[PDB]
Design a protein. Structure first.
Ligand code: HOT
Length: 275
């Protein structure tokens, strides 16, 4: 029953090509799937895995099969009847959002960037409504397709700089701590992948946040977008927007795009005197 929303794939339909990462107990590969061949990512569970690892692996496949949304990574299927077991997802040539924006600095319009954020927010609204707390939302966990559509994923791992204070302090992870993380993602997108808090150490980040400091506005950032990320970073969990509010706000800004022309004042870190 754990695999009720998943398609079982026969191993003869899968070819593994290059290792692209590691799982908890097995490699992740780029490969091809027959069912004209479709590129896929393939996470394996290799011989010797523990009972806990098997339960976590098939549980991961199960929840991924349950999710069916434009802005959540698509599960092609699972291999559970043969060894090694496999989780097989779609593949994106553009890759992860953090590296994508750092390699494409300044190449998009404000409307394109805000559209990315709306898609991420819609995927998160779906997850939260499905009672799934992500716990590791960050641009590194978002894939970008060749239509610029962002797909929330979870590639596995402490992301202090993305994590809400209550989650750091007492391990309270909820959809409202995911909203904090979403605010950080907004900042990542609007800066083309800058490092949150720059060179501050993890301890310095937490000290600054506890003292009320917040990331300053990105350059060229719509006022409404900076205001929204600031609301995501309310210290009091209950004061943060829900994902439904975030989607609604972003939709309204996109549909009346003149709203995005008003920019938040950027605080220069360096002034040049010239005549
Ligand atoms: C195979 C695979 C297995 C699981 C997941 C995953 O998201 N599970 C997940 C679990 C809980 C909640 C959610 C959810 F949806 F709620 F968020 C999602 C993604 C991929 N697929 C994949 N993994 C990678 N990795 C993983 C290893 C890492 O080291 C390197 C990157 N890369 C690419 N990839 C690259 C370019 N195009 C596609 N695809």
């Amino acid at each position: 029953a754990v695999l009720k929303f998943t398609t079982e794939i026969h191993p003869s339909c899968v070819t593994r090509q290059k290792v692209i990462g590691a799982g908890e107990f097995g490699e992740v590969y780029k490969g091809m799937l027959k069912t004209k061949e479709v590129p896929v990512a393939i996470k394996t569970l290799k011989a010797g895995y523990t009972e806990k690892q098997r339960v976590d692996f098939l549980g991961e496949a199960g929840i991924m099969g349950q999710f069916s949304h434009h802005n959540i990574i698509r599960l092609e299927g699972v291999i559970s009847k043969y060894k090694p077991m496999m989780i097989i997802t779609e593949y994106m040539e553009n890759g992860a959002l953090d590296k994508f924006l750092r390699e494409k600095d300044g190449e998009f319009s404000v409307l394109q960037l805000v559209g990315m954020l709306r898609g991420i927010a819609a995927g998160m609204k779906y997850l939260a409504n499905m009672n799934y707390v992500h716990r590791d939302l960050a641009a590194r966990n978002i894939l970008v397709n060749s239509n610029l559509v962002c797909k929330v994923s979870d590639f596995g791992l402490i992301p202090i700089r993305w994590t809400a204070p209550e989650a750091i302090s007492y391990r309270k992870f909820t959809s409202a701590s995911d909203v904090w993380s979403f605010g950080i993602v907004m900042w990542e997108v609007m800066t083309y992948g800058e490092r949150p808090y720059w060179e501050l150490s993890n301890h310095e980040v937490m000290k600054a946040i506890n003292d009320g400091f917040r990331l300053p506005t990105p350059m060229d950032c719509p006022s409404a977008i900076y205001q929204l990320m600031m609301q995501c970073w309310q210290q009091e969990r209950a004061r943060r927007p829900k994902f439904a509010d975030i989607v609604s706000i972003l939709d309204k800004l996109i549909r009346a795009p003149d709203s995005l022309k008003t920019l938040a004042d950027f605080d220069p870190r360096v002034s040049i005197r010239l005549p």
